[PDB]
Amino acid sequence: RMGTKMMGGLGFHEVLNNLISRISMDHPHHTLFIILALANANRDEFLDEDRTEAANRIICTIRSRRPQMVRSVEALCDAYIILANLDATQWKTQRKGINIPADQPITKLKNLEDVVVPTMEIKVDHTGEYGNLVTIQSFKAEFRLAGGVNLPKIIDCVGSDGKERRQLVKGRDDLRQDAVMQQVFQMCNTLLQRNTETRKRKLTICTYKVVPLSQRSGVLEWCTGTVPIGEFLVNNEDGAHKRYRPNDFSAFQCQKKMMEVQKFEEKYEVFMDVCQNFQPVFRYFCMEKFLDPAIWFEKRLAYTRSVATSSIVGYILGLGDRHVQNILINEQSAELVHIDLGVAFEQGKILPTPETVPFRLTRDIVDGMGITGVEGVFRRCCEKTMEVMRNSQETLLTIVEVLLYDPLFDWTMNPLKALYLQQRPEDETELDQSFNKVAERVLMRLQEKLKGVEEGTVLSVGGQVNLLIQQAIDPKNLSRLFPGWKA
Amino acid sequence: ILARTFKNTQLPERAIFQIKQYNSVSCGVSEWQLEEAQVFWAKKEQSLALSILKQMIKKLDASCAPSLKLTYTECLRVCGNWLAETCLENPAVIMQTYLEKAVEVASDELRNGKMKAFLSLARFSDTQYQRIENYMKSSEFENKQALLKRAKRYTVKVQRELELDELALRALKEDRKRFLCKAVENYINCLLSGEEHDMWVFRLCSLWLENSGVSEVNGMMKRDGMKIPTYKFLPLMYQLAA
Amino acid sequence: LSTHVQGFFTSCLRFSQTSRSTTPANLDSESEHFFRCCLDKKSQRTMLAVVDYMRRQKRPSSGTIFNDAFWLDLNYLEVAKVAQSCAAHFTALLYAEIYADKKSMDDQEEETGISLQDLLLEIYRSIGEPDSLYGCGGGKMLQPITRLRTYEHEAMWGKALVTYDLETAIPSSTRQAGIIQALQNLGLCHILSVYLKGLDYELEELHYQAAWRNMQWDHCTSVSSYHESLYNALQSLRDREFSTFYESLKYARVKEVEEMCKRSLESVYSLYPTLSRLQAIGELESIGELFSRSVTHRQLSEVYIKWQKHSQLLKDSDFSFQEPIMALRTVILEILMEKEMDNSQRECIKDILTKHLVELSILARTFKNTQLPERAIFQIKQYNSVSCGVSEWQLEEAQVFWAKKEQSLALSILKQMIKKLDASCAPSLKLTYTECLRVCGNWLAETCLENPAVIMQTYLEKAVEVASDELRNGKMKAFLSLAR
Amino acid sequence: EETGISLQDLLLEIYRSIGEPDSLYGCGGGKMLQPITRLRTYEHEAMWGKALVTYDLETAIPSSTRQAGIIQALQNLGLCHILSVYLKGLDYELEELHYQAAWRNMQWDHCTSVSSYHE
Amino acid sequence: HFLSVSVYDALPLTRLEGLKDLRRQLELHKDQMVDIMRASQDNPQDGIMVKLVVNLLQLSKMAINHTGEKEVLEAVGSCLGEVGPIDFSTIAIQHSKDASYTKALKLFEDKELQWTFIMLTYLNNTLVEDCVK
Secondary structure, eight states, X not given: OTTTOSSSTTTHHHHHHHHXXXXXXXXXXXXXXXXXHHHSXXXXXXXXXXXXXXXXXXXXXXXXXXXXXXXXXXXXXXXXXXXXXXXXXXXXXXXXXXXXXXXXXXXXXXHOOOXXXXXXXXXXXXXXXXXXXXXXXXXXXXXXXXXXXXXXXEEEEEOTTSOEEEEEEEXXXXXXXXXXXXHHHHHHHHHHHHSSGGGSSOOOOOOOOEEEXXXXXXXXXXXXXXXXHHHHTSOSSSOHHHHSOOSSOSSHHHHHHHHHHTOOTTHHHHHHHHHHSOOOOGGGGSTTTOOSHHHHHHHHHHHHHHHHHHHHHHHHHOOOOOOXXXXXXXXXXXXXXXXXXXXXXXXXXXXXXXXXXXSXXXXXXXXXXXXXXXXXXXXXXXXXXXXXXXXXXXXXXXHHHHHSSOTTOOOSOOTTTTTTTTHHHHHHHTOOHHHHHHHHHHHHHHHHHTTSOTTSSOOOHHHHHHHHHHTTSOHHXXXXXXXXXXX | OTTGGGTOSHHHHHHHHHHHHTSTTSOOSSSSHHHHHHHHHHTTOOSHHHHHHHHHHHHHHHTTOOHHHHHHHHHHHHHHHHHHHHOOSOTTTTTTTTTXXXXXXXXXXXXXXXXXXXXXXXXXXXXXXXXXXXXXXXXXXXXXXXXXXXXXXXXXXXXXXHHXXXXXXXHHHHHHHHHHHHHHHHHHHHSTTOOXXXXXXXXXXXXXXXXXXXXXXXXXXXXHTTTXXXXXXGGGHHHHOO | OHHHHHHHHHHHHOOHXXXXXXXXXXXXXXXXXXXXXXXXXXXXXXXXXXTTTTTTTTSOSOOOGXXXXXXXXXXXXXXXXXXXXXXXXXXXXXXXXXXXXXXXXXXXXXXXTOHHXXXXXXXXXXXXXXXXXXXXXXXXXXXXXXXXXXXXXXXXXXXXXXXXXXXXXOGGGTHHHHHHHHHHHHSOSSHHHHHHHHTTOOOHHHHTTTTTTSOTTTOTTOOOOHHHHHHHHHHHTTTTOSHHHHHHHXXXXXXXXXXXXXXXXXXXSSXXXXXXXXXXXXXXXXXXXXXXXXXXXXXXXXHHHHHXXXXXXXXXXXXXXXXXXHHHHHHHXXXXXXXXXOGGGXXXXXXXXXXXXXXXXXXXXXXXXXXXXXXXXXXXXXXITTSOOSSSSHHHHHHHHHHTTOOSSHHHHHHHHHHHHHHTTOOHHHHHHHHHHHHHHHHHHXXXXXXXXXXXXXXXXXXXXXXXXXXXXXXXXXXXXXXX | OOTTOHHHHHHXXXXXXXXXXXXXXXXXXXXXXXXXXXXXXXXXXXXOSTTTTTSSSOSSSSOHHHHHHHHHHHHHHSOSSHHHHHHHHTTOOXXXXXXXXXXXXXXXXXXXXXXXXXX | OHHHHXXXXXXXXXXXXXXXXXXXXXXXXSOOTTHHHHGGGGGGGXXXXXXXXXXXXXXXXXXXXXXXXXXXXXXXXXXXTTHHHHXXXXXXXXXXXXXXXXXXXXXXXXXXXXXXXXXXXXHHHHHHHHHOO
């Protein structure tokens, strides 16, 4: 908002610059990671003017009092930009394997030694006092690569106390949304934590810090011991769906759906024929890692409650297009984390091949619940966590209205953004006032989603969670889904 | 029945004692297992009432090989009306399993039961048609502008695939006609030999002034109109003549 | 040694596997039908558990943990049923899940899979954990029996009372009388004593549940274990005997620990009834030091502050293990009402009781309960309302009345009390007037009993220019209410 | 009966003596402003759930006979078998209400419940 | 007095060490009626105990109840278990939450399981035989 009008009126910009000053005065670690997102938003080596002027003013006001560490973080972020730009496909596309080869021209991020401020790893909020407990002590460059979406880069940082943490640098990927709307998850976590009834159990949504660098670039956190189920369950060399059941196939499951998408009338028949011979094997994910039954039960109940809370969080905050690669399960805590978040809140019902299921719940997930399924714990946890925001309806809606009135918004359906993330499965198969109108429309949609339904009835927590879980397990609608959604 | 109408809970539950201590000694097929489900649905549990019906239909379907014939329709109508307001299952099952089987199976009590089943099926199909109309008015309208903006190489194949997707999704616009046809067929069959529900005679006209202008609904009521009485259509002349 | 030898022999026999499994299945099934089984004889369960983790590498390069059914070739359902009877832990649920998975995999080619739901329900009831209670209160309930009809009404107590005595024919004829006292102790004032006296015509401990919760030393004629010794101590703490009370306290404390520590091998929610009784018996011990000597306002305030600090961490706790300690605190604070003789200090303990009942009502209204937050009205209207104060406790009355679905008396008591509060203006009143205005301003904005243009200049306005962390919190609440 | 305060009490008494449909509509929801415990149960004729836990609050108040007669009428409406034990234990004007639960369930089988119209 | 001066040497042992000294010294005999009696002074540190319980966001800091239960079970088998259980029943804590099942908290076997061959069972048997002395 400060980047919108820095020269307007008489006192507006003045009070805005006076209010954005005390934050940089008291918590510089919270603001130096967000000022760079607009100070280096157009850095290309080898409207926006007002944003650049505001960035220059903020830098000039910060450097006047703050010590010489102001440009150290700028150089550190330029190092990440160089990491995200210099990467080439002729070097680390088929050279991943198992070794971790470093990169020569980077050379310890242009030979850095230590930073006075901590990195994106972790930070505990203060209550009025300054804190410099955790900082950067050293750094090592190994250039790990585990992924194939768009040449992902994985690096490691060793700050104070000597702890190795993995970071993810993305290239040609818009991570601005993954940084502005991801904080809504921790907001809802704090909302459910304030409630005393919702504190007997955890049902917490795990969050991860994300700092954006520029357009089509971003840096997110990678927790140690997190492997996505897309490469752990459905895979040719390592996956419980194939290495355990040799009778059935794994690859032709996608081909059968690609041969059906070409047609519509036989969609339900093809889905039934594919599901009658294929059962879920995701339930064997917990006992293969914890032999002790107590910890096994703890992990399975934590996973069930985590997915039950994430389903409702996704339903209330949109975030459609939940493929098998985005959902990330943790090994030491058994919690599902959304890492991609490619599309906006309300975009699945308007894109080609529209999404029907409002969240991610397949046969693998419904079998991971155990022996009772959804009726036992899933639906009860859902109806318990759905009423935590009905008592505070006038609070959770205030975040969307303030995150949608930003100038850098990219949630509307663009002719290129709605197809650049869907043309890859197609290639694998083939071997303005309108913005404000849509904003008000989706605001009314999210207002009618909770404590009500589009049918006009009340549909309280006793029936809303049942409707949500019935919109998930329905083969007639799953046959109308995208082929790349479920293998 | 008289106790559930006054929002009371303990008095309609008092009726269960005698019918479970003296009448339930023989374990009949289906003679009194309806008021139990009714008094359990009157509470805020909504689970035992929806489970007893699934428990009893399994043994009623095997006993088909009197009062059973007339109660088998209401036993399905109650569950169909109770799962349409709680959304415990997908609505595509009762259309061919529960609400459908209550028509081709079924004496003023039998006529009243058939009337109740027909009106329940008609109102369910009407709700489904209203949902389909709202979806076609909202999602299609929101997608039309997006497609017209995207329509402004490789993009020709994407446009052809979008045209194919449109010609494939018009299947719902073609199937809402069938969704309305069954509603009209149930409305024309319920009001005959039945009273106390004379407020559904113009709901059919609501789906007749613009929906039947291009559909085949004009030819179905002309063959079934010789049995329906016009003594209950008195609030209709004020708009039917217009 | 045998737990490892049973695997070392099976890995080498490759043939003899069926002969070794035929004996194991019979040994595991011989414990059924209420046979002779006790401790030191359930080593088969430990052997089967060890054969599921350390026997993964004993076979060839195949048969992962997902196919651990052929590790011993036994009956997993029978193993789970035997484990739930003796161990009753997560191991039983894991064995039941393995049995269900094996039965589902065998279909791709206590019988008929009907006992699986019963075993799962028994395992969940023996666990009693949060996930177990969630699974029991909805789901896996395919046997609507007359006995299990009340096992899901632990939250609500209104419909649970009419569905408990619904059947006069119960098992052993003790489950009805033994639960009548527990159902009448939740919500009642004085109708429990008549029922206990008329039920005289195993359950003697439940008879004192209503006496030890209200007028303990005054109901000494209610005699026609843990709770019995607690009631004896409550009778003996009348500042005339101390050694007998201190001895009965220790004898009761060393009583329940044995059966609650020997049988409970692993649980997370079974120790809550233990710590609740521990706190309830420690509270009276700590209060006895005050009864042994004179009463001082300073030490009374100190012990109330420490009790509030011990109770504030119980905010993430339900009424399953809080009602007993609350009742114990109420009775140990009410027993000193008869031996007061401290006229200059009576108002001190009166205000202590007032604040305690206020906190009780606050913690009771948050769990959607109705009769428990109304129990606080009895003491504050029979002992505290004898002076007819201006405004010190008339807030929780309106709160518990608004908690109901009447919304009539709660909106009238505030109008009745503000009329005298505006005249009593000519301390605590200054800080309570703002909240008394905010409560009515927020309660008339959701029911629309009057036009909203009045509170803007009369109720919400006067709560600003009138008004010490409590005063700051009250001003914050009033400002946020006006802002919203 | 001055200062216009007795007018509301007189109107409430007249409505209670009338008991007609209009009188019941006027009494329901609250007609006069009275926080007395006696008038707290005069508006709970429709619901019987919360009306049962509100009759045990006037134990120390006078007129215990009326409180017992109202508890008996509230326990005779909704109950299965807990009324016989209460009637047998309340023995320690109201003898007609004691047979209210006996004549409603197992009349000839509860002939030992003796320890007017309904008699 | 000497033992107290040696235990409180350059250490307050109020917030976490006061409980760690009683939770890590559970390797003594069944007649450990001294630690249970010294832990009764935790009532004066309720403000610190509440903060320590609120800061715990994982499955930890609750091993005190498991240690007390293990001590009670060990004293029930031996003699003079009345005073032992009376001293052990002084937890004065009722906020043991954020858990579903407590683990065995055994590390001797985890440290010895470093071997990958089949000789791990022999090492475990040797350790179990040497533990009985």
